[PDB]
Amino acid sequence: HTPINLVRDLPQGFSALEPLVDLPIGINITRFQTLLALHRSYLTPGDS
Amino acid sequence: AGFIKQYGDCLGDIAARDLICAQKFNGLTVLPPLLTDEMIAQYTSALL
């Protein structure tokens, strides 16, 4: 995690990432997809 | 230099900084010169 001030590009600076998870799950990984929330309000139709 | 290594001197971690100690564990051992750095200095001084 780092502080930043720009959306458009990745920073030209160096910081290593440290290990949170290390599980012996054994499942191979070919593909993936991101999870991101959608907003809805009175303005939106709210249809799923 | 000044080939004196206290066994307690390493004890744990620290062996890492001291490569010489690491070798000392190692089976490999540096043997001090017959003429110590001080003696060599005296000899070089004698010659000089």
Partner: protein, 48 residues
């Protein structure tokens, strides 16, 4: 089959299970318990 408590141990129902701590070398989901000793410092000692 006849689950009854009256029956003798052979024929009687089975209070039994089996598990692999298992020998095959592989990554480990689980292993048998490790024992531990006191942390003996300052002395020359074998250690794990």
């Amino acid at each position: 089959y006849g689950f009854q408590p009256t029956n003798g141990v052979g024929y009687q129902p089975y209070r039994v299970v089996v598990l692999s701590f298992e020998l095959l070398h592989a990554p480990a989901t689980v292993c048998g318990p490790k024992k531990s000793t006191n942390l003996v410092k300052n002395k020359c000692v074998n250690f794990n």
